[PDB]
Structure 1
Amino acid sequence: SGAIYVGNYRVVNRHLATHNDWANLVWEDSSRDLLVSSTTAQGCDTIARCDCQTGVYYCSSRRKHYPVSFSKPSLIFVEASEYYPARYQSHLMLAVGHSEPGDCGGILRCQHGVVGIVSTGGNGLVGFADVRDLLWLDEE
């Protein structure tokens, strides 16, 4: 579990979004595994605006943050998980690291701020849903 709190937005994995998220929906995309809802209180996070390929992510199933190199966001085949079928997912980056289903929502960060959240795992990789292209998160 986990979210990004930027401005008056909450960014969560689409598959973990709550009823309140859907009732306060700003934007969602199944292909990216993302959903954004509106918040009453402003949030503490800053979104990275960059093309870094190195950062640090939080792994809840290890209680640890790990430094990683990661691929640029792309369209990637993802094998079946407990929460999605095998399918293509867009806006995805990959690193070598540990990720189980409940690690989704852990932040990946670089020197510029939050890059994305854990969204995929298995076979010794961790996949992150990018948010650095969502420039509208920084306003309004």
Structure 2
Amino acid sequence: SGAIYVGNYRVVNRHLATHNDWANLVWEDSSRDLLVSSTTAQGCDTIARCDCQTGVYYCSSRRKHYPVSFSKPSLIFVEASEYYPARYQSHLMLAVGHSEPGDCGGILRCQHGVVGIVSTGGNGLVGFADVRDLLWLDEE
């Protein structure tokens, strides 16, 4: 589990969104595994607006933050799961790192701010849903 809290927005994995998230919906995209809901309190996270391909992510199944090198956002095949049919997931970045299903939502960050959240895993790989192109998260 986990979320990004920027401005009056809460950014979560679409597959882990709550009923309250759906009842306060701002935007959602199944192809990216992202959902954004509105919040009453202002958040403290800032979004990175950069070209970094190195950073640090939080792994809840180890209670540890790991440095990683990750690929640029791309269209990657994600096999059918308990949450989606077999499809291509867009804006996904891959790295070598530990992950388990419950690790989804952990933040990936660089020196500029939050880059994305854990969205896929298994086999010693971890995939992150990029949020750096979502410029509207910085306003309203």
Identity, in percent, stands at 100
Report which stretch shifted further, 79-88 or 90-99.
Answer: 79-88
Deviation digits for residues 93-126 of structure 1, max 9, x if unmatched? 0000111110000000000000000000012110
Deviation digits for residues 44-89 of structure 1, max 9, x if unmatched? 1000000100000000011111000000101001234443343210
Separation in 1 of the partners of 2:96 and 2:82? 20
Instruction: Describe the SS at the equivalent of 2:136.
Output: helix
In the alignment, is residue 38 of structure 1 matched against residue 38 of structure 2?
yes
Residues 63 and 102 of structure 1, relative CA distance in 2, 3 Å threshold: same
Counterpart residue number, 2:51 = 51
Separation in 1 of the partners of 2:27 and 2:84? 20
Shift of 1:8: 0.1
Residues 100 and 81 of structure 1, relative CA distance in 2, 3 Å threshold: farther
Instruction: Describe the SS at the equivalent of 2:57.
Output: strand
Tell me the TM-score normalized by structure 2: 0.97
8 Å contact 1:81–1:101 — kept in the other structure?
no
Separation in 2 of the partners of 1:52 and 1:84? 29
How many pairs does the alignment contain? 140
Residues 98 and 84 of structure 1, relative CA distance in 2, 3 Å threshold: farther
Report which stretch shifted further, 31-40 or 82-91.
Answer: 82-91
Tell me the TM-score normalized by structure 1: 0.97
Separation in 2 of the partners of 1:86 and 1:124? 20
RMSD: 0.9
Question: Equivalences for 1:19-38 in 2 at 5 Å?
Answer: 19-38=19-38
8 Å contact 1:82–1:101 — kept in the other structure?
no
Counterpart residue number, 1:10 = 10
Unaligned runs of 5+ in 2: none
Unaligned runs of 5+ in 1: none
